[PDB]
């Protein structure tokens, strides 16, 4: 493919009044575009939205076979091994939460409470799965049982402060300042 | 090397009575005529030979990171050339986009 855009002639560009102090505006623009640490937030948000779901849904398919050690009936004698096969279908990560010890629903956990109380700024991970169990018999017959598992919370994943799953992402600078966070 | 005519394997070289015999693991045996009289070889100064820099010298006028010199090309009469310095003897070659090459290349 040929490039399309043709710029004006370089003979007519007027730059002789550019001072080396004017060239600091280019550095200003570069730093404003990239931020100073914006790559960290972008990388963590990519891990949250795209990375972990991909890893769980594609790189953790389990397919193993174990010898049947149950030998109490005729079918138990015929059965030789069982094939355990499952994969996860849904992966979600939420914002950090805390119980509050009221025997009530979960509430939001702000970063300053985590810092003071020695808690972890970790958001829950919800997973769903499909399980297939296949049992094999001496003659060569097999039996297959399938189950589908509703979403459940497995553990919590650490949340980068200031990232998408951080609670200081839906707050303003004044609200950040008033919940004990460094607004700057 | 020698390639077997049936299994296309690399036949083993043996020497008998002034003849080179190639024996394969399939039992095939052959005699070399002339092209198999090379037991071993070695070339020196491999990092400075002409065949090492052929692609580089061909691409030199188009690489914008090469040193340019204010000299007229005798072929296309362009007024600058590309100067490159190869080897530990610091051989200087002037090349041009048209195809001109000092050292007659």
């Amino acid at each position: 493919l040929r490039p399309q855009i043709t710029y004006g002639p370089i003979e007519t560009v007027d730059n002789e009044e550019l001072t080396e102090a004017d060239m600091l505006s280019f550095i200003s623009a570069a730093v404003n575009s990239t931020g100073l640490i914006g790559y960290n937030i972008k990388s963590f948000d990519d891990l949250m939205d795209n990375g972990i779901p991909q890893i769980v849904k594609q790189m953790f398919n389990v397919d193993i076979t174990y010898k049947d050690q149950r030998d109490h009936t005729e079918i138990d004698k015929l059965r030789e091994s069982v094939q355990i096969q499952f994969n996860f279908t849904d992966v979600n990560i939420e914002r950090p939460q805390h119980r509050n010890y009221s025997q009530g629903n979960k509430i939001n956990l702000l970063p300053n409470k985590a810092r003071l109380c020695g808690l972890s700024y970790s958001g829950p991970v919800n997973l769903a799965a499909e399980v297939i169990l296949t049992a094999h018999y001496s003659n060569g017959r097999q039996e297959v049982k399938r189950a589908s598992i509703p979403p459940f919370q497995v553990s919590t994943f650490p949340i980068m402060r200031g990232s998408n799953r951080c609670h200081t992402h839906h707050l303003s600078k004044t609200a950040k300042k008033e919940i004990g966070e460094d607004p700057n | 090397m020698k390639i077997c005519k049936a299994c296309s394997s690399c036949m083993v070289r043996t020497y008998v009575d002034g003849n080179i015999i190639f024996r394969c693991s399939c039992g095939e045996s052959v005699q070399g005529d002339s092209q198999n009289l090379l037991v071993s070889s070695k070339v020196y100064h491999t990092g400075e030979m002409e065949d090492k820099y052929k692609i580089f010298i061909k691409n030199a006028p188009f690489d914008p990171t090469n040193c340019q010199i204010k000299k007229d090309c005798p072929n296309c009469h362009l007024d600058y050339l590309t100067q490159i310095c190869i080897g530990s003897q610091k051989i200087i070659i002037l090349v041009c986009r048209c195809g001109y090459m000092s050292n007659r290349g």
Partner: protein
């Protein structure tokens, strides 16, 4: 966190003119900043903002230390 009450070096009462000096500064800067955004003011490369006559009109002497500490002191209210 504020302009000091007295000059750090010689002890002249710099602070009694601090508040006034602060607000006057803003007005003076509002006269010269032009179309440049505020946070890019220390990057303009065309600004020439001189506070000499303002500090003189405050009555503060021509001492290096006093004007240094008056001009350069950061205000915590402006960053928090």
């Amino acid at each position: 966190m504020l302009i000091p009450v007295v000059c750090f070096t010689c002890g002249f009462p710099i602070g009694t003119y601090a508040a006034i000096f602060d607000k006057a500064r803003t007005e003076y800067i509002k006269t010269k900043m032009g179309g440049t955004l505020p946070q890019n003011i220390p990057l303009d490369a065309s600004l020439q903002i001189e506070l000499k006559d303002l500090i003189t009109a405050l009555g503060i002497p021509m001492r290096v230390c006093c004007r240094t500490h008056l001009i350069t002191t950061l205000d915590y209210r402006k960053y928090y």
